[PDB]
Amino acid sequence: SIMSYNGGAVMAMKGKNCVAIAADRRFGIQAQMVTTDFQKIFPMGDRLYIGLAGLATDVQTVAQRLKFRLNLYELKEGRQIKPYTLMSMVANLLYEKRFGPYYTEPVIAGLDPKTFKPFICSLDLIGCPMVTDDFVVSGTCAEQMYGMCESLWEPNMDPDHLFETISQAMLNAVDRDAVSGMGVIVHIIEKDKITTRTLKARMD
Amino acid sequence: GYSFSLTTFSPSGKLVQIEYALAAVAGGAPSVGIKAANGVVLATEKKQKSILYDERSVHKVEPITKHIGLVYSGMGPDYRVLVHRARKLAQQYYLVYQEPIPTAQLVQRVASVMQEYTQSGGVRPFGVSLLICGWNEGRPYLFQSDPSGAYFAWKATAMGKNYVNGKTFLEKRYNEDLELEDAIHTAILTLKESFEGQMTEDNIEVGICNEAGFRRLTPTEVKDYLAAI
Amino acid sequence: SYDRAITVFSPDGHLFQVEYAQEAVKKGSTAVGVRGRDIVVLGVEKAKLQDERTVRKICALDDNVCMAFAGLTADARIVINRARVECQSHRLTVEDPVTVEYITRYIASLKQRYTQSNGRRPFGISALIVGFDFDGTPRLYQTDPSGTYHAWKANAIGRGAKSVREFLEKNYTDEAIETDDLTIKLVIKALLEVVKNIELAVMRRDQSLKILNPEEIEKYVAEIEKE
Amino acid sequence: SRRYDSRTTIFSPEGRLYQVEYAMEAIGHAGTCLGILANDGVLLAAERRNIHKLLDEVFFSEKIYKLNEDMACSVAGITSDANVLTNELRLIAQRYLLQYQEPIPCEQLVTALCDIKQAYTQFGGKRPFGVSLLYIGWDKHYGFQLYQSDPSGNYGGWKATCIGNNSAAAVSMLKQDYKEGEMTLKSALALAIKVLNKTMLSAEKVEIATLTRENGKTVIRVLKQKEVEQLIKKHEEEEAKAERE
Amino acid sequence: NQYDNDVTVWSPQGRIHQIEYAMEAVKQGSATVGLKSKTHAVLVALKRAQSELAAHQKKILHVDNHIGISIAGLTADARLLCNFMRQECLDSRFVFDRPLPVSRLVSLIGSKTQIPTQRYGRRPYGVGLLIAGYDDMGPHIFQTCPSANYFDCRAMSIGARSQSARTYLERHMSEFMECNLNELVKHGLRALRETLPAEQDLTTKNVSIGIVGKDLEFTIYDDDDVSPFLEGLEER
Amino acid sequence: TTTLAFKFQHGVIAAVDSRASAGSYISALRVNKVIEINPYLLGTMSGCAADCQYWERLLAKECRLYYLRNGERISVSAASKLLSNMMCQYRGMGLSMGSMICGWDKKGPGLYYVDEHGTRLSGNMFSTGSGNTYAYGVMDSGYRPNLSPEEAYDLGRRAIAYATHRDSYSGGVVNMYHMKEDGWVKVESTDVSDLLHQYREAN
Amino acid sequence: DRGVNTFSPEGRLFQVEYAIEAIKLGSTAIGIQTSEGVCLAVEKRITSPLMEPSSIEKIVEIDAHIGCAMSGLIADAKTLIDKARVETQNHWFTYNETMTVESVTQAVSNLALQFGEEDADAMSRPFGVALLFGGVDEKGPQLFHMDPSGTFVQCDARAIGSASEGAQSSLQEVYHKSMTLKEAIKSSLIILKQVMEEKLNATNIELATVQPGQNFHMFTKEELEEVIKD
Amino acid sequence: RFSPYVFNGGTILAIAGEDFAIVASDTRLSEGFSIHTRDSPKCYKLTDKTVIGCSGFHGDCLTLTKIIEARLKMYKHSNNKAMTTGAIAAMLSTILYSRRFFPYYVYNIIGGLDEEGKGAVYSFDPVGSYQRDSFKAGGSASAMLQPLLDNQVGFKNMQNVEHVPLSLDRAMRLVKDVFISAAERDVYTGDALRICIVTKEGIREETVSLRKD
Amino acid sequence: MEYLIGIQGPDYVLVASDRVAASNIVQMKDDHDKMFKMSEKILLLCVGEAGDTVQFAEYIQKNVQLYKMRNGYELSPTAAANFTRRNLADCLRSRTPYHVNLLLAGYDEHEGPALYYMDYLAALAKAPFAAHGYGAFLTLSILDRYYTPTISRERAVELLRKCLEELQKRFILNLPTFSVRIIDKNGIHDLDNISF
Numbered sequence A: 001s002i003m004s005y006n007g008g009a010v011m012a013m014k015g016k017n018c019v020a021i022a023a024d025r026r027f028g029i030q031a032q033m034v035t036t037d038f039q040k041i042f043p044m045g046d047r048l049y050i051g052l053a054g055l056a057t058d059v060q061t062v063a064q065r066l067k068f069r070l071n072l073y074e075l076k077e078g079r080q081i082k083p084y085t086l087m088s089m090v091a092n093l094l095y096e097k098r099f100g101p102y103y104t105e106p107v108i109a110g111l112d113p114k115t116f117k118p119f120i121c122s123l124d125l126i127g128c129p130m131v132t133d134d135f136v137v138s139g140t141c142a143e144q145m146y147g148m149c150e151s152l153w154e155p156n157m158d159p160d161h162l163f164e165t166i167s168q169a170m171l172n173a174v175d176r177d178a179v180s181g182m183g184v185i186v187h188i189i190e191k192d193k194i195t196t197r198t199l200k201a202r203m204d
Numbered sequence B: 001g002y003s004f005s006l007t008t009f010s011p012s013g014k015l016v017q018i019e020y021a022l023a024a025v026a027g028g029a030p031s032v033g034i035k036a037a038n039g040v041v042l043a044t045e046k047k048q049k050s051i052l053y054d055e056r057s058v059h060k061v062e063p064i065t066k067h068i069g070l071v072y073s074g075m076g077p078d079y080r081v082l083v084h085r086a087r088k089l090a091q092q093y094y095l096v097y098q099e100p101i102p103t104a105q106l107v108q109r110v111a112s113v114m115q116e117y118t119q120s121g122g123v124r125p126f127g128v129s130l131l132i133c134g135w136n137e138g139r140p141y142l143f144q145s146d147p148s149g150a151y152f153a154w155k156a157t158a159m160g161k162n163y164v165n166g167k168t169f170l171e172k173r174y175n176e177d178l179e180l181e182d183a184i185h186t187a188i189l190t191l192k193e194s195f196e197g198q199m200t201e202d203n204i205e206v207g208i209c210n211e212a213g214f215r216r217l218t219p220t221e222v223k224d225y226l227a228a229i
Numbered sequence C: 001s002y003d004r005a006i007t008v009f010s011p012d013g014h015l016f017q018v019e020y021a022q023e024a025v026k027k028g029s030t031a032v033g034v035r036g037r038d039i040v041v042l043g044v045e046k047a048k049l050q051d052e053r054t055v056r057k058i059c060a061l062d063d064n065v066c067m068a069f070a071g072l073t074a075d076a077r078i079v080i081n082r083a084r085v086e087c088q089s090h091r092l093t094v095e096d097p098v099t100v101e102y103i104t105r106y107i108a109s110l111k112q113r114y115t116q117s118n119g120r121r122p123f124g125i126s127a128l129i130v131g132f133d134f135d136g137t138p139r140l141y142q143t144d145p146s147g148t149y150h151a152w153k154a155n156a157i158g159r160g161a162k163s164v165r166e167f168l169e170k171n172y173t174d175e176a177i178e179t180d181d182l183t184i185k186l187v188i189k190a191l192l193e194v195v196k197n198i199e200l201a202v203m204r205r206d207q208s209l210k211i212l213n214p215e216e217i218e219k220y221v222a223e224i225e226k227e
Numbered sequence D: 001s002r003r004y005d006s007r008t009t010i011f012s013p014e015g016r017l018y019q020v021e022y023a024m025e026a027i028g029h030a031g032t033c034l035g036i037l038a039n040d041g042v043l044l045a046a047e048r049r050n051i052h053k054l055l056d057e058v059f060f061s062e063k064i065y066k067l068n069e070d071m072a073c074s075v076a077g078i079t080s081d082a083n084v085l086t087n088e089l090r091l092i093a094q095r096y097l098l099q100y101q102e103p104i105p106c107e108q109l110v111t112a113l114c115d116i117k118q119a120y121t122q123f124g125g126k127r128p129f130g131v132s133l134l135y136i137g138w139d140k141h142y143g144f145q146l147y148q149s150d151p152s153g154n155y156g157g158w159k160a161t162c163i164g165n166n167s168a169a170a171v172s173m174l175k176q177d178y179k180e181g182e183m184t185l186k187s188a189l190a191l192a193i194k195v196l197n198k199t200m201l202s203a204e205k206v207e208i209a210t211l212t213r214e215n216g217k218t219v220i221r222v223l224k225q226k227e228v229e230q231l232i233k234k235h236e237e238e239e240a241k242a243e244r245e
Numbered sequence E: 001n002q003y004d005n006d007v008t009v010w011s012p013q014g015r016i017h018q019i020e021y022a023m024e025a026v027k028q029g030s031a032t033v034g035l036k037s038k039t040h041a042v043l044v045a046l047k048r049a050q051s052e053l054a055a056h057q058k059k060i061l062h063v064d065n066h067i068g069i070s071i072a073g074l075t076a077d078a079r080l081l082c083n084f085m086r087q088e089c090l091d092s093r094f095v096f097d098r099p100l101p102v103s104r105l106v107s108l109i110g111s112k113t114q115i116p117t118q119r120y121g122r123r124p125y126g127v128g129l130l131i132a133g134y135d136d137m138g139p140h141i142f143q144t145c146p147s148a149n150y151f152d153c154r155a156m157s158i159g160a161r162s163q164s165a166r167t168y169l170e171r172h173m174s175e176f177m178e179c180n181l182n183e184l185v186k187h188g189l190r191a192l193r194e195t196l197p198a199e200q201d202l203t204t205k206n207v208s209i210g211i212v213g214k215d216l217e218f219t220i221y222d223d224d225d226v227s228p229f230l231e232g233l234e235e236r
Numbered sequence F: 001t002t003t004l005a006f007k008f009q010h011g012v013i014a015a016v017d018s019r020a021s022a023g024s025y026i027s028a029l030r031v032n033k034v035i036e037i038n039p040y041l042l043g044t045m046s047g048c049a050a051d052c053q054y055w056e057r058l059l060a061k062e063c064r065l066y067y068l069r070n071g072e073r074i075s076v077s078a079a080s081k082l083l084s085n086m087m088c089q090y091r092g093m094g095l096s097m098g099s100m101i102c103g104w105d106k107k108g109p110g111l112y113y114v115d116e117h118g119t120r121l122s123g124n125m126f127s128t129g130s131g132n133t134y135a136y137g138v139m140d141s142g143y144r145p146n147l148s149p150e151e152a153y154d155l156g157r158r159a160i161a162y163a164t165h166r167d168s169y170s171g172g173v174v175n176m177y178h179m180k181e182d183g184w185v186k187v188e189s190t191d192v193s194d195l196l197h198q199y200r201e202a203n
Numbered sequence G: 001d002r003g004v005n006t007f008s009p010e011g012r013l014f015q016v017e018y019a020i021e022a023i024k025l026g027s028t029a030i031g032i033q034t035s036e037g038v039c040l041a042v043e044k045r046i047t048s049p050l051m052e053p054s055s056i057e058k059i060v061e062i063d064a065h066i067g068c069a070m071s072g073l074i075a076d077a078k079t080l081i082d083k084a085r086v087e088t089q090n091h092w093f094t095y096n097e098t099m100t101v102e103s104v105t106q107a108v109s110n111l112a113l114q115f116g117e118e119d120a121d122a123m124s125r126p127f128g129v130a131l132l133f134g135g136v137d138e139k140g141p142q143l144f145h146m147d148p149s150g151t152f153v154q155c156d157a158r159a160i161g162s163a164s165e166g167a168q169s170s171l172q173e174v175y176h177k178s179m180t181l182k183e184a185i186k187s188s189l190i191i192l193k194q195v196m197e198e199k200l201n202a203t204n205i206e207l208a209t210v211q212p213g214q215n216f217h218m219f220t221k222e223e224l225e226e227v228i229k230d
Numbered sequence H: 001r002f003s004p005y006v007f008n009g010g011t012i013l014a015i016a017g018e019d020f021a022i023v024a025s026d027t028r029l030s031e032g033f034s035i036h037t038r039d040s041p042k043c044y045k046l047t048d049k050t051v052i053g054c055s056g057f058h059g060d061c062l063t064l065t066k067i068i069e070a071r072l073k074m075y076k077h078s079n080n081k082a083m084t085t086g087a088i089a090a091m092l093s094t095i096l097y098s099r100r101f102f103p104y105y106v107y108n109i110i111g112g113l114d115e116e117g118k119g120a121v122y123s124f125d126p127v128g129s130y131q132r133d134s135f136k137a138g139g140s141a142s143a144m145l146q147p148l149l150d151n152q153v154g155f156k157n158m159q160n161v162e163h164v165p166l167s168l169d170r171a172m173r174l175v176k177d178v179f180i181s182a183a184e185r186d187v188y189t190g191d192a193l194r195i196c197i198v199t200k201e202g203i204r205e206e207t208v209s210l211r212k213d
Numbered sequence I: 001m002e003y004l005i006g007i008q009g010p011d012y013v014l015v016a017s018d019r020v021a022a023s024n025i026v027q028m029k030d031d032h033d034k035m036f037k038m039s040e041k042i043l044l045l046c047v048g049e050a051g052d053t054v055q056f057a058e059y060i061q062k063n064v065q066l067y068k069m070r071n072g073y074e075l076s077p078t079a080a081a082n083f084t085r086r087n088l089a090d091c092l093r094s095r096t097p098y099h100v101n102l103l104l105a106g107y108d109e110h111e112g113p114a115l116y117y118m119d120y121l122a123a124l125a126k127a128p129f130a131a132h133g134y135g136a137f138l139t140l141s142i143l144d145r146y147y148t149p150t151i152s153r154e155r156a157v158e159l160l161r162k163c164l165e166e167l168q169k170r171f172i173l174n175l176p177t178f179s180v181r182i183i184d185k186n187g188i189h190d191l192d193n194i195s196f
């Protein structure tokens, strides 16, 4: 399969006045792992990050082309982008390639810069948005990530409780996938601060 | 067609067709726009030459989307091109971003179109200055855009016949936290300075913009404001 | 697009727009070029509050070929960029690098096509292109708005280029050629006819371009005054 | 058709472009826009021609435009033409960033717009853009930079320069007082207000911004009306203190 | 004058002066004559030399086996309009395997040359043709012009001093249809030298002949080729 | 097809067979598989005959057009580069073309393998076509940098001959050229089967 | 003000008219057709001794059997010379043969009135250049003239430039149809020396010839210095 | 699905003598296992000194002959002379190669007179690779005729045999006997035998009969 | 089939390519060079389909050289790599997709040494070490074993030796000789070709 050529895993999650986003660090080509620090999560503002799984060239291309449009928006408008607006910008960007699409399944996670209420969503390769009040997953271990997320997720979690939930959900999912892992990285987005951590994950 | 600019620089260094287009605006039927604290007003003279004209048919005060509205002084046909285009530009923003277009951003986009006809091949510029009311974050917006393609955010202003008198009238008589009740009354008083005749619900047109978007006021709604003058 | 005939023949057989482009050259800063055996040199005429680097009128086109210009500085920059593009595009098509004749012929061809194609006025510049060929022979050519080109031993273009060329016609002897120092002195003498207010650069056999700073320039100002 | 053609893209008999010169006369009427380089920063200070009681003040600026994260510019001429050119500058900055994943160097961004402005003088039969721009920025190659451009598509790098109403009077005044290599942003801010006092002094009529590098990242900020008004009173006191002695 | 420069500009007289100016390109161009019998069609051309050292100008051109032309005007428009005829002939031989009717070819010239007379920034074809050709309807002489008008002819002349030729031809019309080839060529030659003054007359250098009919394809005769035809009658 | 080329002390040898072959049938016994662009530049041919003929004639056109423009004969590097660019513009189109461009220029003696894919290799020794491998065997075994002119001709002649012996799609005649400082010289158009009969009788 | 494709009342294009006027400004060139070969001579008109004499190519090789001399706008000519050079090798590619001198001249003559404003990709004005083609094909040695109109014709002898009027009178007296090539070469340099306001020498002119046996040859300093005598 | 080609067959042949050039063919046109027509000769006259044989797909043959006929005129109009035999063969290569990616399925053999007066044959493949030959067979029976022509005209695998050139008497008789042998063994060769003979005097055509089954 | 390798250091980047130009079963050239000089402090090592490698590499080379001539300063290894990625990414969904695998080794004055990796898909990855070809499947685990971030260049060549010697022992393809080059402060430096 196309998505599984490079593989990868991305996840986002909600708590009380905070959102988390996380992803594996493997860049590989089929069987062969190449590097163990490949960026799949990219900043799109202070309290707004986007995570991109699947085909690695399109992970990088969509990130770059989205930043192109983001920077034009922020200069034109004179503000930071709202999270729901960035979803639609991705949806527009991906659906422009409807019959020749970028093989990536984005996952957005951020706080609204006016109200600071949590927001998460994910999109398919052709840019169909899906907003949830709980979590979103994307990667070769989607099935594995869903089963962890569904069981482990609780509503109204504090920043420390959210970190433990999303980390254990990632770690155990990517440990049952051959083409995901080689480290995990996790960003805890709060109002006051962004707390990025990398986990002691399996390296096989 | 003709692939050369009709608007060009004179030895003085002035784009002569733009100043000539401003003369077409300056000699147009007058129009006024006022920004209250809680809302925005747009009012204009709709005095046609005879009682034969059906007053309900065509409108000067026109909507662009559900939260932005529009009015002009100068050329009527030129105005209708800008209304149709502005309406498209609003949807082209809403389709992409899934958010109601900012009023600043609508003006900037229509300004770019108005600039296009001061340079591109075989076309004069528009003989129109637009007044663009709106509501974005949770607060009012009023903008002018004139034939050049330059735009100015106004608290209040006037256009057309006796625009100099309307502007000075407004300057002293406008307060920066007026109620929308009062601003609608002020806009009609600004028009009554420049008017030639007895005013009615038919021969003027008013629209408003607030919390629940933009709309055109009905004749009976205007008639209530005309009763206490 | 604009299909108007810009450049046309007059009653007396003149291309007036090309002739007016040559008037735009004669107002621009006095550029001078000189050839030698081992070295080839270019120099230009000159506010206190400027970056000298940005208004530099000596420009490298490839590793082996550079040029000077005189006339409209905006018009110059497009010819230089399209020359720079053609230099690398030449290597892409036939591997071997550009001879000074080929790039001059291209700039000439580009200038000529603007004197004859619809919609476009001519380039208001003359250039002085210099460098070393494949075999290693030194070269100096000169183009103008019409798109004619000719090799030179030395030449001037810009303000008072008659009085500089009159000076160069006399002074270009075999004595001034011999050494690298003596060829550079000749350029400064020529610019001192019309002219810290001298831009100056050099090209040697296998080496690339090298601009001389005002400290290096004022060394040769002392070596001229003795004689 | 041939009768109606203005012919904007031709040499006049003297050997020069009429519409280019006539566009520079339009700039000579427009507001006094200047820029000053320093050791620890770069500034732009402009005359604010949009001045009325009833103007709203939506935007963070009026004549100043941000372009990239490490760059900004101000203008003088027809403001509508400036909105086109600034939009295109922003597009170029991101087009470079998409390609190389570094910020565009300041000279490269200025040459890119100036190649477009020059095209309107050479071909298409179109009138030129009647705008001179003053650019400020930082890059890894040359650092703190100031550039000028004009409707011809010609640019230059400056230590300090001016465009607009009383252009020449301001530049000669800057040629006296500017010291090369020795100027800081605090000393440059004093000279900016000194020159605008000559040409044009309430803070509604002035508009200033400062590009600086603080902690490995560029910082572009407009000054508020409290910052400008205290700098006006410091000039009025320093002017009056010399007058007595 | 205001109505002189563009082909689109109608004059107040009801005339287009750029057509009428393009007609003068034919008149100042050299003389040539064309005529037909029951069996043949002949073109005769006075070839104008530049100087007396330089060789004489080629005035009769080949189009097909069954059609050829003689020219008068700008040589580039002659060659352009010749190649159009050559190509439309080639199309008909390709498509139908049958030579293109001469009247139909002449209609396509009129259609083509008319187009630029109605369009701005364009000009009429500065050239008039006499077109000799044989088909299922026997031999033909057709004329064409810069105005895009075309004429079927018993005979015609065009060029410098060609009024003299037209007067000769209008007398001997009923003779032409009965003539043999040698008598028909001799008639065309006598019409041509009537255009010349009394001082100078026809030689093998300054005359070209072009002949097509039932037996013969469009052959062109220039130098020693011509010598048979001239040696018959030569006085006045 | 079997073509070969090698540099040595006295310039560059270039030898080709002459068989053309539509399937197992022999289309033609004697085809000329060398193009003579100018006196100082040759081009061997292998693969599709029409591609080889057209594209190397188009090289020659451009080489001739280079002489008229610049007023000097084209280099072997530039000519080999120009053909590979023609092949690069028609990549993925099923062109089959396996030339070697031999010449002499200011840079010295030059030899370039140029390919249908866009491949372009400067080297001392090369061989192309179906008999490629069999030519290399004989050529490499008896090679020296310091051969005499006659010993060089014996190597190239034998190498094509033993290749045509094994390869079904090579045969006919050996067509051997010799490049020098003062342009190429045609050495011989020797029949291959007469040479193979000669070498059999030597044992 | 008027269009480029505008006829005068006399019945001829103004821009073509004015393109003939441009050749008068150009420097003079002579070509003489003989049975033993076509010679071609031209003045360089060197404005300075700093200017390199060898880099004013006013006679050039079109092919091994054809040359072309030019007068008028030198830059305008190089477009037409390259198109001729392309045409000959395009003909060699397609037909495996040399073009005639007429066929080459005709190909260049087709480009003469390919100018105009509306309906265009293309040239605004004509080429202000007269060309003297001169070569040897299957029909013996041939010399051909061309002008900005597109009119082209064979010439026994002809000149073009500032003293075209003056030189053609000298060619009338000097030319004989049964003469030799070496007489025709020396005839040109006599006729050129008169009309030049500079003095004739090996650096100041270009000569070139084409014979049946020999290819296009442009004469060197040493070969010009030998002929100089007369 | 739609196939744009079909095999109509027939054989062509050309020989170059010292003072002549034979170009011959059969007259059978086939499709499948039926005969379209018995009077469809594959020889086409181009100029007084040049003739072409064309066999394979007949739709391309008709078109390609009509292209050559059209191009001959276009050359004569431009250059004021007929194309030489070598110049036609060079031109044909470019026309066949211009359809490299959708071939003219036509085996061409040109035969006629070069500029030096002698015989000149040019053989082709469908995409335009060519060479000058003394002799060549083509079309359906190419394989049958060619090795006999190699034997009798080339003198191949023969010793103590003087290599005498071909008289037009001998070559005409050879062309009759080879096409008789092809007609016997090839289904697509038959009915009749067109033989065009190109000498300096002109073209003349014979028609010997063949097997009609 | 071909083979590339890069080893980033503290202040340098070692690189090496094989020198076989293969065709069908024949080793046409033993001395072929697969490294392309982009800048004074940058090498592009390129491997893949026969005509695609050189055409792509040279297109990039000339545009990097054009950037130098236009602006008076060369591209950084980061800028050059993303430029290489941008071209290969745009060709990917087009008529002419280049099947090329490549390493871009370089040295910036500010940022220090950098080794970049890129497959034919145009996924760009900065790495401390990397390798292309079937040889990478044997040699990458040797780099995992013995590489440290503080490796000296003379030791890094002895590490390279163990990778290249493993190809002679285990890899079925010949690959007898290898090009070797170091980049640092002082630009590109040729080194002795590791023959056997």
Ligand SMILES: *[B]([O])([O])[C]([C][C]([C])[C])[N]C(=O)C1=[C]N([C][C][N]C(=O)C2=C(O[C])C(O[C])=C(O[C])[C]=[C]2)N=N1
Residues within 6 Å of the ligand: F001, F002, F019, F020, F021, F022, F023, F024, F027, F031, F033, F045, F046, F047, F048, F049, F050, F052, F129, F130, F169, F170
């Ligand atoms: B030589 O390469 O044998 C030779 C060299 C020329 C310069 C004359 N070329 C040819 O003989 C030749 C033959 N053809 C057309 C016929 N096609 C093929 O022979 C062919 C074959 O069949 C053997 C095959 O294999 C099935 C392929 O695919 C690999 C391709 C072509 N053109 N030139």
Ligand code: NA
Residues within 6 Å of the ligand: A174, A175, A176, A177, A178, A179, A180, A181, A182, A204
């Ligand atoms: Na895993």
Ligand code: NA
Residues within 6 Å of the ligand: A203, A204
């Ligand atoms: Na594993």
Ligand code: NA
Residues within 6 Å of the ligand: H182, H183, H184, H185, H186, H187, H188, H189, H190, H211, H213
């Ligand atoms: Na049979």
